[PDB]
Amino acid sequence: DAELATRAIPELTKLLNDEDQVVVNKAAVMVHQLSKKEASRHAIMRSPQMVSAIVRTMQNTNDVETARCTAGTLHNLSHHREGLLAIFKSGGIPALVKMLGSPVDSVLFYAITTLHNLLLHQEGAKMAVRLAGGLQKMVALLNKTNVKFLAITTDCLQILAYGNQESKLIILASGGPQALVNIMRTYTYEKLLWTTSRVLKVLSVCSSNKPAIVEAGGMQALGLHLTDPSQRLVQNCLWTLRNLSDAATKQEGMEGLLGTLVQLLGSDDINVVTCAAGILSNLTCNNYKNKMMVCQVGGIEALVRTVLRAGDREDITEPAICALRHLTSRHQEAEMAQNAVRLHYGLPVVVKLLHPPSHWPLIKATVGLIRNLALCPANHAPLREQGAIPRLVQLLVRAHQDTQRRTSQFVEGVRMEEIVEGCTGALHILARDVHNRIVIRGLNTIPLFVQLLYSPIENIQRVAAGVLCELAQDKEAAEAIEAEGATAPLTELLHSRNEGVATYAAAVLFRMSE
């Protein structure tokens, strides 16, 4: 066998290089029968001349019975390292890519299994399949019906697409997203769905593939599997949906996905909750219809429960609080959402997040949520009782003092100028309640508010003149604003570009005398 077949191997190489393509066909059937046996499979594999003859036959053949027998030999050899190296050295890859264009099932089945083993275990195979144009051929085969075949073909796409921009673009250019979305909303085979979600996960980070998966109905299609038993599928759909979410802001027909994610916030799995909170904040972004729907499926309670459960974990807390901030402004159900946070015992935890160990991006988000909650008059007193005002004043002063030493950048990704605008803006709305105004004034914040009228930032001038405007409705307070030399800058801010700053500037000037 290692002695008997080693002398019969150069004989079959001569028979494969023959001029009569009837003798070549008989020889290919012989090499095929020998690849079945372990001893003689190793003999075909060990000789480069023999493998290059099998590869040469395959890409030049017109006969179908020879095509399967030759691709079947390469399939048998691909289970071995020396076989894989032989197929590679002899130009088996451009030959196998050509075979992905045949109508015969057995041939495709042999060619994709061989190419898969090559992509997985042979170095340099990935680049060779790309240069050969195998991706266009592979995506074109996603119209097939055999589930196991589709699972291998989809895995080939994952291996090729991972970390390679060019290959992601070819998949896109060749109808990839649509073909992949079709698979998710059709097949039940777990190994296919999981492998398909992995390709979609890889494609979702590409700036051009991302809006194409969305328009293919990808959000809704991935949404169909979030209730599946296997956690690997649920998790891959979630990571994909999370990557896609910042480009699905304008997508309609999202009722189901939104409702399922709200349900997912209650799971004991840390990664599911983190993703579901992240998807909800992005899908709640500037889309009034999504905002209205999340409030109607018990989203506010779910998000308050999520923040309570999370504690110091900002991976969950930041998107959850951002989702709440979006749900509490600019829509018909904002008023309901503002009350719901209170009714579901959310105010104590929201105020707690303004204090350390919470980092700057979370604090900025929480301040904006409090600004929004303060629009509801029924939240004016409970927010005061949780100690929101002294902390907002503390955040404002320290942030302003950092802007003063940096007069003569970013801290944790946030400018201190943003904390000044945010906190002064939250106090501006809180200042609508009479008791809140006494508290704000009692904190010796009027001298600071006057200093904030001189800032080069228009938005800080707007909120500063705004808080002074609400404070000035009470005569004792208006007199204190006048005694601080506020008359001069407010008269200068009357000539401003923004009509909002000028109105507030005029209102304080009026309220200080009449």
Place this chain on the structure above:
Amino acid sequence: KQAAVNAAVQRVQVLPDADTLLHFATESTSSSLSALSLDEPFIQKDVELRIMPPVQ
């Protein structure tokens, strides 16, 4: 200007809110795919292949 009109110009004016998107880009963070139903015997892959992780 009167007190009822001055308090009205202030009321007509509104304060907005900006909804910022969070940018996530996660592409990387067991049990083999089952082989295709073909007319070939079961050939086991070399140990070096099924023990070692795929080429990155």
